[PDB]
């Protein structure tokens, strides 16, 4: 089979709880940029089951599935308490284990799969990464009907998904902020109750009016920047939670007395566990959260994409 | 009655004794704790602009004493009862008051801050529900609990501890530190590591109940923490009275999902690389005071003897300015309590 | 002013002519525009109207303001008031129960903090929320729902049922199964947002649930105005770790085999009213249109006895 | 090797550990009332014969992929292991798995000289405790630790432990004392039991044979009642009496399998927001918690009586009328 690695290799044979998948969709995201041994990339997997190991239960050849790529070894503290995404020595498909940048891919254990019924491989693949990430980020915001949330860059891919999830799972008031009329509009279509265009308005001033000067109870900053970190924490209400997600090389700078006086919290997040995967997939399969705007490409265009869902 | 008040140093005035009406309670002060917060008060910063403070005002937010007279609406308390008081009282209408976090009230009634406090012979408690009847503790032992006790109790709760976790208490040999160690020992089951910089402070942390203690002046603290936790790091850090140094050092001891609980008002900034926060799911959380639930918790622990009173130094009401000076010039080791 | 009051147990309410209280301090005098009436029934615990006058200590409210009121107010000193669960206060001040209510032209609200400024809703639309809204909002929270769970609402086509369906739909992301006992009630459950619906008087509820949940059962059941029948049937639909939230006051007992409880880690939990946080939540949702007002029937204050005889909203 | 299976003593072969499996040389096999019931097919899909013993502790004889463990290590084992695909396994509640692998129940247990642990992650290296002290913790320890967590205790609350002087009761008292800060009231029916509850750490003890327990509980709690009751091995009597001691919002944590029904007036439940919650076993988090406590000496081992592997049936008989078998 073909395989873009960090070639023409052989097709692994599934044994035990393993499952061999015929890749129908291999998502690509900025994380693949940080990657670029040998190792096949592709941590956003979706496809049809080609063959299952003798021990596999509940799945048959032909089944359409999406896969949770981050799998813990089980013995460490994080695996034991149920936070395997924070495993000390994880098995990460497309990162430290061969991924979906190929015609076929092996899933260590069948429990990490999710049978697709409503979505197709292309619509699901991105959910195994951005979906899990965003779903956990909303969970960390600790929202309820009495609260108001601010989603930064609400008109982007991650932003609209965050708005959709928050609207489908919390009942909180949602304020989306972006910088272009188009994005602001995308944020509104995602379900934001209020939208702000930082390019035509002072977001803080607008947020202060919307919340009657209280500020927001949570901010979800997906793919934060030095700019966002210096601006949006100012919008936090007392006890507000600033949920940061991403890997940009920037530092958090905040006056300590402001944190203690207002009991604010800065919380980080990046990926997610089986519970997060189950949640986003149930939502997507129910249509409560729509698939990301996607652009399909060929497997050979992998490098191009990195320079988007690849279809073997 | 006599009363030391902030008029613009504090001045000893001779004002009248308020008469309790309705739910109000008149208390004959037996103990008036003094802490660094009173230094901020005397400096003005932190009050008139934001806290609605209107000079002159009797300071003293750490109250304990005997009930002198009660309002006709007061229920469950009688003259002669010995009580401690929760000084932070919400107005009720704001969001924080509605969700039960009145200490974060938009316009609180704060005894000793924007309402007359205990630096006097008598003090009025707006509503009797803010008191706690003492049975085991005396006024002197209880007064500091209304401030440092509530604060530390809440900080421990924010650490989200459980039997599978390990906590690090920074400056574990100090007043606040030993209190945090004791509370964590009594309410969580977590492994407790105390760190300080002096042999006597380190020993005090041990006596407070710490499972492990570290003298950061002798051993590299981070390396010892890694050894004790077998490279995992700690699940929480409680940094009471944080400094520029502690904030730059201890967050590095955090395990994945670790929570760094900062308490205090020192003029310093938190500086941390964002990718480190997201990769490890760490959290930086602030705390300063506490609500009725926090007060209820610390008083129950103290009354049961599960948490010991702070090392105290009793002084007279007229020595209020002196007590506060000892705090400005950091020459006041030991909780100073005024006995009117 | 006019005011229908309970002058004698067993006997009917009497329309007396008492004086209009004068608001002092934090108190607020409301010109009643809507006085809800429910089975729980100067009475009137479902209050909504315009502010007539405010006490000298009132802040944030002015005469003319349209407001809804949380009738259950704690004394503050007891354990429950201290931890923020004042609805379970040991000696509460309950408007319309042990304190004069809204069955009159004017009513005094002990403290302004218990009010909520109406901006989208009118008095009639809001009054019911101060009771059924709070109750249902808290019941949904106790169900501990999330997107991977499924909720069963019993009697989902009724007034409380449709409200519970709407709230669960607007705040949880959970799959919702609604069941009731007559077609009009069933169709109403669908309109309320239930993903699946069932008529228990026409078919066996337990088999359908099994099918829908693919034999897992439901993660939570909210049994509004439970009965001897519901309690003997629906707990059987619970999945492992399922929570059975019972709401109501009917004279019936809960009877369940203990081993079934331990083996599945199920929980039976009761709920009846709610606190300031629940009131804040339901008002926020209603004012935002995320949950619609109850179907109401307006009547006159004089018809109090009549209404109790038979959502009916009295209007002075 | 010898092995008492479903009881008969057989002479079967010693399995060979492959992959993540671990072969343990059993040094302690706890026995509890659950084995009375064992001695399940149509349900748990039990394929007879099967070696009992779900309370495992011993030395690692051989490791299969195994990482972090070596031959000679002393370990205790979490016997309840989920298959992974079901809802409960996915959300981290594998003890409630739809099709679990349960050592000593539907998989060969410790009633033998050797036993296979499917995956090494279910073990816990012993440092302070010996095999005999640890074995019971894999069952009663996990169970009681989870029951205490379900009580939702905190320093502002008070807990009542029923039968506080028994094996499970003192365990519950000790765990609650070490992990919550709640005030603890232990109740029992004999002077000696009441005494055991006190030594366990109870702040207050009640001899229900001398004083009316509900009355004493009200006096202690100043008429509020308790915020939680942990009723380990409940009976028809406990369920009819103690729920009356619950304060508003109180949680009645029931644990056990006795054939009794819960009977309570609904209005009482709704008016007080009380909760009846069941529990029986526990997950990896529960195992980690109880073992950390025990290994730190914060919770003491159960009073134990060691016996021979061949006395398995006798041990179970004794229950029908903490015993640990030593191969
Ligand atoms: Zn990705
Ligand atoms: Zn791991
Ligand atoms: Zn102080
Ligand atoms: Zn307030
Ligand atoms: Zn009503
Ligand atoms: Zn109360
Ligand atoms: Zn057992
Ligand atoms: Zn399972």
CA B126 vs. chain centroid, Å, equals 21
Does the annotation list B97 as a binding residue?
yes
- Nearest chain B residue (CA) to D175: B189
Q: Do D249 and C79 touch (CB under 8 A)?
A: no
Distance CA D229, CA D221 (A): 13
C-alpha pair distances (Å), C277 with each of B95, B196, C91, D59: 9, 42, 19, 55
Q: Between residues 134 and 153 of chain D, which touch chain B (CB distance below 8 Å)? A: 145
**Mind telling me how many Å the CA of D91 is from chain A's nearest CA?**
5
Q: Between residues 231 and 270 of chain D, which touch chain B (CB distance below 8 Å)? A: none
Does the annotation list B271 as a binding residue?
no
DSSP state of D210: T
Distance CA A100, CA A39 (A): 11
Distance in Å from the first CA to the final CA of chain D: 10
B-chain CB neighbours of A263 within 8 Å are 104, 285-288
Q: Is B188 on the interface with D (CB under 8 A)?
A: yes
Quick one: tokens of A107? 């899933």
Q: Are residues A256 and A193 in the same domain?
A: yes
Q: Are residues C267 and C288 in the same domain?
A: no
Q: Do D121 and A275 touch (CB under 8 A)?
A: no
A-chain CB neighbours of B90 within 8 Å are none
Q: Do B187 and D288 touch (CB under 8 A)?
A: no
Q: Total structural domains in chain B?
A: 2
Chains in touch with D (3+ beta-carbon pairs under 8 Å) read A, B, C
Does the annotation list D97 as a binding residue?
yes
* Experimental resolution (Å): 2.0
Angle at B163 between CA D28 and CA B172, to 5 degrees: 130
What CATH number corresponds to the domain at position C114? 3.90.180.10
> If you write DSSP's letter for every residue of B61-122 in order, what string do you get?
-EEEEEEEEE-TT--S--TT-EEEE--EE--SSSHHHHTT-GGG-SS-EEBTTTB--SSBSE
- Nearest chain D residue (CA) to A113: D85
Distance CA B119, CA B12 (A): 9
Q: Which ligand is nearest to the CA of A27?
A: 1
- Nearest chain C residue (CA) to B93: C113
Spell out the SS3 assignment of C232-299: HHHHHHEEEEEEEEEECCCCCEEEEEHHHHHHHCCEEEEECCCCHHHHHHHHHHHHCCCCCCCCCEEE
Distance CA C180, CA A211 (A): 40
Specify burial of residue C288 (Cβ count, 10 A radius: 0-12, 13-18, 19+): middle
Q: Are residues D234 and D297 in the same domain?
A: no
Q: Are residues C245 and C298 in the same domain?
A: no
For residue A113, the cross-strand partners are: A67
Q: Are C70 and C95 in contact (CB under 8 A)?
A: no
Q: Is D70 on the interface with A (CB under 8 A)?
A: no
For testing the chain B interface, which of C60, C75, C114 should be mutated: the one with the most B CBs within 10 Å? C75
Helix (H/G/I), strand (E/B), else coil: C227 = coil
Distance CA B26, CA D97 (A): 60
Q: Are D165 and D197 in contact (CB under 8 A)?
A: yes
Distance CA C99, CA C70 (A): 13
Q: Are B58 and B5 in contact (CB under 8 A)?
A: yes
Q: Are residues B295 and B284 in the same domain?
A: no
Q: Are residues D173 and D192 in the same domain?
A: yes
Q: Are residues D188 and D76 in the same domain?
A: no
Q: Is C284 on the interface with B (CB under 8 A)?
A: no
CB contact set of C103 (below 8 Å; sequence gap of 6+): C3, C4, C5, C13, C35, C42, C43, C44, C96, C301, C304, C314
Q: Are C48 and C123 in contact (CB under 8 A)?
A: yes
Distance CA A65, CA A119 (A): 9
Distance CA D265, CA C229 (A): 14
**Mind telling me how many Å the CA of B288 is from chain A's nearest CA?**
6
Q: Are residues B111 and B121 in the same domain?
A: yes
Ligand 7 centroid to Cα of residue D32, in Å, is 4
Ligand 4 centroid to Cα of residue B233, in Å, is 39
- Containing domain of residue D322, as a range? 1-143+281-327
C-chain CB neighbours of B98 within 8 Å are 113, 276-277, 279-280
**Mind telling me how many Å the CA of B264 is from chain A's nearest CA?**
6
Say what the alpha-carbon torsion angle C258, C261, C264, C268 is, to the nearest 10 degrees. 170
Describe the crossing of helices B199-208 and B175-187 by its angle, rounded to 10 degrees: 30
Q: Which ligand is nearest to the CA of A77?
A: 2
Ligand 4 centroid to Cα of residue D206, in Å, is 43
**Mind telling me how many Å the CA of B187 is from chain D's nearest CA?**
4
C-chain CB neighbours of A168 within 8 Å are 147, 173
Q: Are residues A158 and A245 in the same domain?
A: yes
Q: Do B95 and A270 touch (CB under 8 A)?
A: no
DSSP state of D243: G
Q: Are D253 and D228 in contact (CB under 8 A)?
A: yes
Q: Do B99 and C280 touch (CB under 8 A)?
A: yes
User: Domain boundary residue among C271, C287, C304?
Assistant: C271
D-chain CB neighbours of C248 within 8 Å are 266-267, 270
Q: Which residue has the tokens 């059975």?
A: C244
A-chain CB neighbours of D285 within 8 Å are 80-82
Q: Are residues C6 and C114 in the same domain?
A: yes
Q: Are residues C138 and C1 in the same domain?
A: yes
C-alpha pair distances (Å), B138 with each of A36, A230, B144, C311: 68, 49, 11, 56
Q: Are residues C116 and C201 in the same domain?
A: no
Q: Is C90 on the interface with B (CB under 8 A)?
A: no
Q: Do C257 and D256 touch (CB under 8 A)?
A: no
A-chain CB neighbours of B95 within 8 Å are 146, 214, 237
**Mind telling me how many Å the CA of B207 is from chain A's nearest CA?**
28
Distance CA A170, CA A163 (A): 11
> If you write DSSP's letter for every residue of D258-300 in order, what string do you get?
-S-EEEEEHHHHHHHT-EEEEE----HHHHHHHHHHHHTTSSP
Q: Is D278 on the interface with A (CB under 8 A)?
A: no
> If you write DSSP's letter for every residue of C180-215 in order, what string do you get?
ESSHHHHHHHHHHT-SEEEETTTS-HHHHHHHHTTT
**Mind telling me how many Å the CA of B287 is from chain A's nearest CA?**
5
Of the CA atoms within 13 Å of residue C143, those in its CB half-sphere come to: 36
Which experimental technique did the depositors report for determining this structure?
X-ray
Q: Which of D265, D273, D280 sits opposite C253 (nearest CB)?
A: D265
What CATH number corresponds to the domain at position A218? 3.40.50.720
Does the annotation list A44 as a binding residue?
no
Helix (H/G/I), strand (E/B), else coil: B271 = strand
Cα-Cα-Cα-Cα dihedral sign, residues C41, C220, D264, D242? negative
Spell out the SS3 assignment of chain A: CEECECCECCCCCCCCCCEEEEEEEEECCCHHHHHCCCCECCCEEEEEEEEECCCCCCCCCCCEEEECCEECCCCCHHHHCCCHHHCCCCEEECCCECCCCECEEEECCHHHEEECCCCCHHHHHHHHCHHHHHHHHHHHCCCCCCCEEEEECCCCHHHHHHHHHHHHHCCCEEEEEECCHHHHHHHHHHCCCEEEECCCCCHHHHHHHHCCCCCEEEEEEECCCHHHHHHHHHHEEEEEEEEEECCCCCEEEEEHHHHHHHCCEEEEECCCCHHHHHHHHHHHHCCCCCCCCCCEEEHHHHHHHHCCEEEC
Distance CA A290, CA A190 (A): 9
Q: Between residues 49 and 68 of chain C, which touch chain B (CB distance below 8 Å)? A: 59-60
């Amino acid at each position: 089979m073909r395989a873009v690695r960090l070639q023409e290799i052989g097709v692994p044979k599934p044994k035990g709880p393993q499952v061999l998948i015929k890749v129908e969709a291999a998502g690509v995201c900025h994380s693949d940029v940080h990657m670029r041994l040998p190792v096949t990339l592709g941590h956003e997997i979706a496809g049809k089951i080609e063959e299952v190991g003798d021990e596999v239960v509940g799945y048959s050849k032909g089944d359409l599935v999406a896969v949770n790529p981050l799998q813990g070894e089980g013995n460490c503290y994080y695996c034991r308490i149920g936070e395997e995404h924070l495993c000390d020595s994880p098995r990460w498909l497309g990162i430290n284990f061969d991924g979906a940048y190929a015609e076929y891919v092996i899933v260590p254990h069948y429990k990490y799969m999710y049978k697709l019924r409503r979505l197709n491989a292309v619509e699901a693949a991105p959910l195994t990464c951005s979906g899990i990430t965003t779903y956990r980020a909303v969970r960390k915001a600790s929202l309820d009907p009495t609260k108001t949330l601010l989603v930064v860059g609400a008109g982007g891919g991650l932003g609209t998904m965050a708005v959709q999830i928050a609207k489908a799972v919390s009942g909180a008031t949602i304020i989306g902020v972006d910088v272009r009329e188009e994005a602001v509009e995308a944020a509104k279509r995602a379900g934001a109750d209020y939208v702000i265009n930082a390019s035509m308005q002072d977001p803080l001033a607008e947020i202060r009016r919307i919340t009657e000067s209280k500020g927001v109870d949570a901010v979800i900053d997906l793919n934060y920047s030095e700019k966002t970190l210096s601006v949006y924490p100012k919008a936090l209400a007392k006890q507000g939670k600033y949920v940061m997600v991403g890997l940009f090389g920037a530092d958090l700078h905040y006056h300590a007395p402001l944190i203690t006086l207002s009991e604010i919290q800065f919380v980080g997040s990046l990926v997610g566990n089986q519970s997060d995967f189950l949640g986003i997939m149930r939502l997507a399969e129910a249509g409560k959260v729509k698939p990301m705007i996607t652009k399909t490409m060929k497997l050979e265009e992998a490098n191009e994409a990195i320079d988007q869902v690849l279809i073997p």
